[PDB]
Design an enzyme around this catalytic site. Sequence first.
Site, PDB file in Angstrom:
ATOM      1  N   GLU C 763       0.912  -0.841  -0.199  1.00 13.00           N
ATOM      2  CA  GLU C 763      -0.284  -0.159   0.003  1.00 13.00           C
ATOM      3  C   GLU C 763       0.669   0.956   0.144  1.00 13.00           C
ATOM      4  O   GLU C 763       1.255   2.098   0.989  1.00 13.00           O
ATOM      5  CB  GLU C 763      -1.170  -0.012   1.437  1.00 13.00           C
ATOM      6  CG  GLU C 763      -1.619   1.264   0.992  1.00 13.00           C
ATOM      7  CD  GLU C 763      -3.247   0.316  -0.017  1.00 13.00           C
ATOM      8  OE1 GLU C 763      -3.293  -0.551  -0.287  1.00 13.00           O
ATOM      9  OE2 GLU C 763      -3.816   1.661  -0.452  1.00 13.00           O
ATOM     10  N   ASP C 764       1.360   2.020  -1.114  1.00 11.40           N
ATOM     11  CA  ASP C 764       1.843   2.482  -1.337  1.00 11.40           C
ATOM     12  C   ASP C 764       3.200   2.859  -0.298  1.00 11.40           C
ATOM     13  O   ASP C 764       3.890   4.131  -0.576  1.00 11.40           O
ATOM     14  CB  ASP C 764       1.134   3.897  -1.241  1.00 11.40           C
ATOM     15  CG  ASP C 764       1.828   4.870  -2.205  1.00 11.40           C
ATOM     16  OD1 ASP C 764       0.963   6.172  -1.939  1.00 11.40           O
ATOM     17  OD2 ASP C 764       2.799   5.091  -2.710  1.00 11.40           O
ATOM     18  N   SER C 765       4.315   2.081   0.225  1.00 13.90           N
ATOM     19  CA  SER C 765       5.004   1.786   0.525  1.00 13.90           C
ATOM     20  C   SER C 765       6.247   1.663   0.149  1.00 13.90           C
ATOM     21  O   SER C 765       6.352   1.655  -1.653  1.00 13.90           O
ATOM     22  CB  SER C 765       4.955   0.764   2.527  1.00 13.90           C
ATOM     23  OG  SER C 765       3.885   1.720   2.930  1.00 13.90           O
ATOM     24  N   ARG C 933      -2.720   6.299 -10.240  1.00 12.70           N
ATOM     25  CA  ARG C 933      -1.768   7.698  -9.574  1.00 12.70           C
ATOM     26  C   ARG C 933      -2.004   8.253 -10.741  1.00 12.70           C
ATOM     27  O   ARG C 933      -2.005   9.711 -11.634  1.00 12.70           O
ATOM     28  CB  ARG C 933      -0.926   8.131  -9.561  1.00 12.70           C
ATOM     29  CG  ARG C 933      -0.918   8.236  -7.333  1.00 12.70           C
ATOM     30  CD  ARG C 933      -1.906   6.774  -6.868  1.00 12.70           C
ATOM     31  NE  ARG C 933      -1.590   6.711  -5.965  1.00 12.70           N
ATOM     32  CZ  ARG C 933      -0.661   6.757  -4.443  1.00 12.70           C
ATOM     33  NH1 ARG C 933       0.732   6.133  -4.961  1.00 12.70           N
ATOM     34  NH2 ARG C 933      -1.282   6.604  -3.318  1.00 12.70           N
TER      35      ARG C 933
END
Lengths: 90, 67, 1132, 117, 50, 48, 50
Positions: C763-765, C933
């Site tokens: 998750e976006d890490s 994104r």
Amino acid sequence: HTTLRKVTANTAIYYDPNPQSTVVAEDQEWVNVISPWLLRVELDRKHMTDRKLTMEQIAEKINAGFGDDLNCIFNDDNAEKLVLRIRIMN
Amino acid sequence: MIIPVRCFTCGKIVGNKWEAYLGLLQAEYTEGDALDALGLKRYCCRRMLLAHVDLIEKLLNYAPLEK
Amino acid sequence: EITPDLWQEACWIVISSYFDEKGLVRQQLDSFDEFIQMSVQRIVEDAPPIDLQAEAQHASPPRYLLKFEQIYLSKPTHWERDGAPSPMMPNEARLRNLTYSAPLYVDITKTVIKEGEEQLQTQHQKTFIGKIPIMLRSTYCLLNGLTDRDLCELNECPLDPGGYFIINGSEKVLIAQEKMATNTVYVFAKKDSKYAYTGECRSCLENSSRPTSTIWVSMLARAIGQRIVATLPYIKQEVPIIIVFRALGFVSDRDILEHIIYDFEDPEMMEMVKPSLDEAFVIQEQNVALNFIGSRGAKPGVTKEKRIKYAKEVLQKEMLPHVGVSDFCETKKAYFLGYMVHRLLLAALGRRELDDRDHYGNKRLDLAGPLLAFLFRGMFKNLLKEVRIYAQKFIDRGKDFNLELAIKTRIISDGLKYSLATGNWGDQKKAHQARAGVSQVLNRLTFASTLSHLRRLNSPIGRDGKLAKPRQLHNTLWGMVCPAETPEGHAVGLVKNLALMAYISVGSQPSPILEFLEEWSMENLEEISPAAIADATKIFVNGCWVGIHKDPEQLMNTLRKLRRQMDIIVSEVSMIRDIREREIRIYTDAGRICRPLLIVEKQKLLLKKRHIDQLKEREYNNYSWQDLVASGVVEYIDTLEEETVMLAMTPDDLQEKEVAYCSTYTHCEIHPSMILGVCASIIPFPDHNQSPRNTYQSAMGKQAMGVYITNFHVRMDTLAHVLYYPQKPLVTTRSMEYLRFRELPAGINSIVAIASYTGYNQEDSVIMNRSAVDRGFFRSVFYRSYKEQESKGFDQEEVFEKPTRETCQGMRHAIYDKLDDDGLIAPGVRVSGDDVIIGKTVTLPTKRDCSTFLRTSETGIVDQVMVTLNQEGYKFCKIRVRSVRIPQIGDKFASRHGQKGTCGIQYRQEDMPFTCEGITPDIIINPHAIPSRMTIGHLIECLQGKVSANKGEIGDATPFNDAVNVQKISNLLSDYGYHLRGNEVLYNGFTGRKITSQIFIGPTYYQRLKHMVDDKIHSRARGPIQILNRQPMEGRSRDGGLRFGEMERDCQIAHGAAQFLRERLFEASDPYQVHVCNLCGIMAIANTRTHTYECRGCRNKTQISLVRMPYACKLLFQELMSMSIAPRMMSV
Amino acid sequence: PGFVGIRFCQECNNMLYPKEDKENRILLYACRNCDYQQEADNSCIYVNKITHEVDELTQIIADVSQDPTLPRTEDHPCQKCGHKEAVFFQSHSARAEDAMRLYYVCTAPHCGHRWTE
Amino acid sequence: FIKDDYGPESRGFVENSYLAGLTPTEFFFHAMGGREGLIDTAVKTAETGY
Amino acid sequence: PVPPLSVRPAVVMQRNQDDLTHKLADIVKINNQLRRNEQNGAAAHVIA
Amino acid sequence: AKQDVIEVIEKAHNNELEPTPGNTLRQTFENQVNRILNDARDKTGSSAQK
């Protein structure tokens, strides 16, 4: 909902000294025919035939709303121009 | 500030290559020729000098705290 | 000659010339310089002299004038009664928490007449009014024009743009404040009101003391119908416009109609103007209309001749000041008011269209100059109205007076210092009334952040408002306001920065334009009759209707010709010809935002190979941007003039023979990338990203840590963040060399592999390379500074010393041996949480300490310790503490495309995947962050970075280059032995098996943000408590507790955990017991040790109940009882 | 129909108001300030066009031709002078009920011709 | 853009993708379009939470 | 009713009184002044 | 799609475009332009997925 603004093209008032004189050249008033200051409104055929009204219906609406304080003289649904004249009775 | 001693990715020593790199750029050598004249074959080591800004020179223009 | 296919270098050469001649805080510097040069002079000179009599007699009184002019201003000085005064270095002001201000001086001439007709005037030169805070790098700052070697000798950063004030040793930056333009007519139509259309023109004289006197001319929204009213300042009710004209002096009616309808052959105008005419056929002369206005005035006169004078004064000064306030300006005011009415009628008939409020042509920017002028004018009036009081207090007795004692030098300096230090823009008494947010503390975390804070606008409309129309990006923001850069919080679109070449006009006198205009063929209003006014065109200068011209053409050409040679009209002045509507307006006031554009004749630029050549050899031929402007090659175009002009994006692509689109261009843009700001100009390939990504990158560019300034070691500053090994990006825009981002970068060109390796980046890490971090990857050091000053009473003297246990009473368990005997730590000592740093004790009427403790869980090392004297002469100490921040998991990292993320795990080089070579990615991010994104600019950056690091060149990521694309980059990469699309065959770091899919990998410029996890992590277990209600404190620093808020309470209700809800809100926050009488539910008095429980008001002493309560509930009950409410709580 | 236009008293320059000379039964315009009378030649007092069929060509002015930001086409020539290039644009007027119709203005100044197609 | 230009390029249509990049007009239009969503995200919270 | 010290706590040397304590001080000042005027002066004008 | 938008603009300019019942000329022109642009975008997207 339809107001009489929706159906009229323009409105004008004149000072006709005699209703018989017919300051505006209209043989309909000649053949049809007490105040000198009168009222004249021009409708358009477009909205008129879109909403299916008649000069008789408009005149009877005026007579019901305002009583016999004024008489509407409407041109027949034959001429290209859509005229009804308004006076005020005494 | 100053050139890192080792490349972050590879770990190859890059700390001794900065002055030689500037000396080579003080010649007809381009960056692409200076880098592999210094022996930088991997782009991980090449970027270490190619993208380095040497701010220690701007830091030395200030007078020290002591004398 | 004409320059074909050399544009990609010619345009950037002229841009480099522009950014060499003009800096990046040029609007700040010019506004402050113009302020302290001429606006302070005009404010100090236009103040009326004060004449003052005695108390009208003494027995059964003469006065004086005291007029002053010719202000003098000196350079900053510093010392007072201890040595001969010396100039203030700005770095010394920062260190000693002084105010980097400059004293201003005036010479006064007091001429006094008493008796016998003998006049003596005494002049006092260099009279001291106060010390004005002065902006750094200004024209009177001590760093003006100094070379870089001298700046380094003064411990100043040569790269520091300046443009900020040093007050109490803290950088202050005046944020530009938007406002509606003045002296211009706006016709609006508010939806739900008694009137349909309304025309307003807020008016101001040339920086007069009077505020914006706004006048509305409005039309009712429906007998007769459509009357026109004009609500007037200092008038309670609206006044019909014809009454206004008759009061102004026009008895007739034809004359009044000559000022509104300019052509009498248009009966549609008459049919709508007669309903307002027949409203006021009972007023026929001037005096009855004056009486009518005076009756509606805020101060209604008791007699007729008092209302006459009051309304005459209102018409003379309050209404339309900008068109003139003099003996006879009635004709000009009538012409302008009739123009306002004509403008309202044009909007009512639909001949024109309603003006747009968000059109930034209608906006003006209040920079440091105008803001300081507005505030200094008020303080100067306050100073005069106390010199007057002192003079009265001495002349009532009539002995004599001294102007040196009369002048209160404190007021001006203290008002300026308070306003700039706090942000409350106004008098200190009206702290809540004055608008705040102006003069913020300069953000000094990154050089890009400093530039962005120094180039920032502000819309002073209320926040948290559901009207999104002001917040939206308006079409007129092209090239003057950065579209990407804006905060994401409750200030979206309200706080907007400034484009690169966008320049704000500073203002000049329109008088030379006036004398130039009056001599070609135009006529002033007083000369002509309105007979010939309909066919000709109306000239406006700064919004005031100056005259009439028969030939708009060849006067527009003449004005442009003069502006292109700077003969009389300066470059900042904008001339605007409205064509379909005959107005031709000239603007000269300050605050007009404008940007430079090229000049285009038939279809060719005036920029030539000769210009490019003689400007390329700069520093020897000194052919600078100013010379380029003087050559008539470029113009400054604001929004008004941008409406009436035709631009071309690129001369080559938009000025050629083809299927014709315009073929009538007037201007061309130097380079479209200049529409971006400062933080958005560091984004590589910003047109390949979704715009919210660009906005987020513009926001996070202010948080990326790097060398924020060169002199960060002399700069004793709190919350200073510097990175060990900053790097200029491998792929960069051509606009970074002008932001000096390649000299003070914030980030490291990391080798990223966009792959799902283990799942610790899902998750976006992000995964980081532990070995790289060990080698110094994104390693930084955190500087925190601690200040303290000794003093405050008659005997309670503060002193720095080592507090000794037998002497001082109050002490922590902290060890005080780390202090030196003067009360401070020597630099270079390891320190930790709850360790004393400054040993300060106050005398106890033995002693009590006020020692400063190191902030809990900091655990750093003291860098340096400075001791000095503040402006009160007391010992002052500031201590700076180093603490390095090795990148750990949870530290927030981000790229140049709004792809933020915290480190999820750190693998060593062995655990990390690797190429066919030993290249292991420094960073691994989740591929699931791209597709929604849509940061295709991130992928193109990662590709071009590999291409550049292999080629030896620095990559070029100019937004609209059009000379580089993905296909060319791929073909270039394929030549170096890599897959053309950047993919590589990585091998698994644990098993050694090659990954079935091929990994996208390459160098990408990542940034380390200030949001470390060690600065956010905190817990609590029955720590400190607030004083009013015995609940846990708030804040990480105060060892506070988290808020179990109203929504968490609701969530627990939904869970149906009533025992857990009570545990959270009662025992875990503030368990408390109170004693309440059983008869009356009022709190009783309990004496537990003697077990005497009595409730007075009942005399029972026997039946008493103990009830357990939250302390907040008890205190609510006590407040209610203080409000006479009686909450009675019977337990039966 | 036409439009009624306000005309002013020659004595004190004020707005005339309609009146009926009851004796002659003829329209008279009377200034309420002074005793001036005048006989009306139009016989119409008030006209109001509700359909508002407006000829925008009258409100279009000739100098619009030198606007750099307006489109230019040589396909439609001018009628009097036969000039090849013409400048065209839309109504640019509020309360244009349904009008994407283009209005054309001829360049080569001193022509100033305006038409609609 | 020329006055009264109702064409797709003159009113916000972007015929380019994220790979070919956006021409400066299209970039500004896309920024202005995304600004609306960004504003809505912030404004909506103060109503939805209430 | 005057609220107790718990409702209006006073901190030590920032002693600093509470915002409500200041208003209560104004209340008692004006109440005492009005009282003493109403017995001694009884002007019936300043009392209003 | 651009050619279709241009010819729709031509029909609107030459008064050759009949307003859709229940809509005025401006909104029906807007509807035609939006329909053409949305159809073009959908077709290009479908070609992309194919």
